[PDB]
Ligand binder design. Sequence first.
Ligand SMILES: *[C@@H]1O[C@H](CO)[C@@H](O[C@@H]2O[C@H](CO)[C@@H](O[C@@H]3O[C@H](CO)[C@@H](O)[C@H](O[C@H]4O[C@H](CO)[C@@H](O)[C@H](O)[C@@H]4O)[C@@H]3O)[C@H](O)[C@H]2NC(C)=O)[C@H](O)[C@H]1NC(C)=O
Ligand SMILES: *[C@@H]1O[C@H](CO)[C@@H](O)[C@H](O)[C@H]1NC(C)=O
Ligand SMILES: *[C@@H]1O[C@H](CO)[C@@H](O)[C@H](O)[C@H]1NC(C)=O
Ligand SMILES: [Cl-]
Lengths: 160, 328, 151, 173
Amino acid sequence: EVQLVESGAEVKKPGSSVKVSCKASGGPFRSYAISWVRQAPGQGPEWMGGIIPIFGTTKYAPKFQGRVTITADDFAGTVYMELSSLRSEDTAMYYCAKHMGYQVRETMDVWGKGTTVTVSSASTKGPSVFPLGCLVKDYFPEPVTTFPAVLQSSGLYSLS
Amino acid sequence: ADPGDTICIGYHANNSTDTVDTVLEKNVTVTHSVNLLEDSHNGKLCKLKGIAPLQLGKCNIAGWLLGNPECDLLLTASSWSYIVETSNSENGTCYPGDFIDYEELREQLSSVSSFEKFEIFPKTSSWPNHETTKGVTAACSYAGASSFYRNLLWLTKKGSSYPKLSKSYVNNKGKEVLVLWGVHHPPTGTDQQSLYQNADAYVSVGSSKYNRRFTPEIAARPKVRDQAGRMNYYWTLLEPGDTITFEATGNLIAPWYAFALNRGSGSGIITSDAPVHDCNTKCQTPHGAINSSLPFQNIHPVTIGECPKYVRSTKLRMATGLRNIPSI
Amino acid sequence: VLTQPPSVSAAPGQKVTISCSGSSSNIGNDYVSWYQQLPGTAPKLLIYDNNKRPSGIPDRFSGSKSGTSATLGITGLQTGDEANYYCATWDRRPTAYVVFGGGTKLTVLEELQANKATLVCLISDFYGVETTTPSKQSNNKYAASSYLSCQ
Amino acid sequence: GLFGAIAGFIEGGWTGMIDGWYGYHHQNEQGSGYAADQKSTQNAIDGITNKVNSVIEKMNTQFTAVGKEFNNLERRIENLNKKVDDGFLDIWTYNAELLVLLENERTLDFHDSNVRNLYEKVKSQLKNNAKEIGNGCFEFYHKCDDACMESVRNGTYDYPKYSEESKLNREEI
Ligand SMILES: *[C@@H]1O[C@H](CO)[C@@H](O[C@@H]2O[C@H](CO)[C@@H](O[C@@H]3O[C@H](CO)[C@@H](O)[C@H](O[C@H]4O[C@H](CO)[C@@H](O)[C@H](O)[C@@H]4O)[C@@H]3O)[C@H](O)[C@H]2NC(C)=O)[C@H](O)[C@H]1NC(C)=O
Ligand SMILES: *[C@@H]1O[C@H](CO)[C@@H](O)[C@H](O)[C@H]1NC(C)=O
Ligand SMILES: *[C@@H]1O[C@H](CO)[C@@H](O)[C@H](O)[C@H]1NC(C)=O
Ligand SMILES: [Cl-]
């Protein structure tokens, strides 16, 4: 069966844009449509929109219409989702998923593994260390080095 | 009938204006179609796999490997994704004469992706009882003073004497070693004595793969760059574990540096005047880089990497949809 | 949106049903699909066209649709079926789009020198304020923290 | 075209039918509209996508290909290299252009066939409960509401259900 491989994790500022890709195996032209579906933690999935093969027609969810663009490069076997005017609630896992036929609908039979997009006003920073026991603050984004990290009101991650 | 309800079967039209050719009919407007032919490039020379090409610039392959003094920028180069000569690659053999089997050397280098340069016969160490200066020569100048190749070493008499040398190198690099030398053919000499102290001299170079003797051909030859003498350049690829042996009584332009070669497919030599930039591509032509998944291109037959297939076509549009008939 | 129960439970071999309530623009005149989601993985299709099973899915799962409501049934309940389950359909109304249910969870039974100060309240082994959520320790119990920039 | 439907007995296309390549238009008391035929569109999209993928698969990418140099006494082999490069280029240009022309012909005919076969499949469902009125249209001999229209579009039209009312209308003329 088809495998759908998505591009890597993204970290963006509010007001910016993100473009995620999904490459379908086989093909490269496809007889089935592909949609983007996202899932904020720990909420249900929300269909963003999809694109029909050959015709290139798109359909978008009302919640994203005006700021999502879905495109296809058919010779590369790839579809893209660009979401602009990002907000912190665009922080989510982003999935591509194919439909069984050429039309977009409720049935998506094969899904990518998902890629994370994190939208925050923070910039990338390293942690300073204080004696208590130990205190690591303030860092952003997240690591590979104790109590799970807290996320402060500065958008920076404190953990003890 | 009675009430007049109807159903009709039909087909899609749209406002597309793309056309395709068939055998029976040219220029047929269809509803959907795809272009198979890439005709765009970015006008730059780019990296492949994060590796920049080697831009020889004002120098050519010969000036690079021999170490022409105008090519000093190239001395530190050790790896590249391809090699670029320009339409101004003219600094090659500064002291005139023929580079023997040069087209073959170029064919060999085309599959070399990197090397390790090293001092094969270190100057003033491997040669205890021969002179190591002058030449030097103005033909190969640097900052308005006579100089020489950085990779070859011009040997000369140690005051009136010159004993039959025998210098031998063993390949313990674990790969092919490219070894370059020259043999000097002075004019009405005179010079022969003034440089080599012996008039009936010879050079001999030996290994299992290669064996040749050289007798100086002392003769009157036109001025080339103020020089009436000529110098022939030679190379060989010493196999791993094998031994190369130089023997002579004069007229040897000896190896000083040599190159330990890493082979790789997908590499090559191109001529391009396009500019190098910090871009990445999977497909490079001499006009510029291609970023495409199309199956054909008409940009250039010369390609590095993985490219669409070169064809002469100016149009290749394949119908996907049907004949477009938006109005009767 | 479509309305699901937030959380249904049973015992191995037992049977549970997850309901999906909508309206006439969505479930009323469209097919319903169901998706299973384990932790750290993508939704996986269980039922489409109201009651068809893709290959890989066993007859333990089935679905039904009646008027404005749909139902997922899971018999022979197993430990591995512990998961989130989402219904989905096409909503023709506002503008057409795929809508999902809200989801049902099935459970199977020195700084002071830098002019700063942060109170550190560490919390463990149970079962300007910034309070870390409960994570579950490997102890299979709950952990947390709060910091004031204690109960 | 070969099958007589496109630019044939169905004279023009419909910019109003958006959801597919082939389909329906209807008119009854409730109103008018267009709807794509999904099954015939899907099968056509399967064939055409496969056709394009087969062209791509046969035409392999070219990997590194660079020039060769020859000295002033190697003109014969220089010319031989040239003859080889030119000849292979001639052949691949010819193959690519020709495959496109031949497949474009076949592509337009495939679409034409598909339209013809959809027309004939509907005609064969309706039988004498509808009359053929040209340009790909049928006038029903009975009232056909949206549920009835949909039954035609999905291949489950019920001839016997409407046969008597059709017959009385057909026999009035
Ligand atoms: C080729 O195909 C495209 C469809 O892909 C087709 O385009 C469409 O473009 C037109 C205009 O450029 C769009 O119409 C605008 O649509 C909105 C509503 O959706 C109207 O409010 C707009 O009204 C203004 O502009 C008119 C001038 O166009 C004014 O007269 C009017 O007073 C308003 O100022 C306008 O109608 C249309 O929505 C898109 N449709 C889609 C689906 O994208 C293009 O015109 C086509 N060419 C041909 C020959 O058909
Ligand atoms: C290099 O080339 C220039 C221009 O061709 C020439 O004038 C110059 O003497 C050359 N120098 C060497 C070392 O070859
Ligand atoms: C097609 O149409 C009929 C009549 O409108 C409807 O009841 C039925 O569900 C449909 N049948 C199929 C196979 O789609
Ligand atoms: Cl219709």
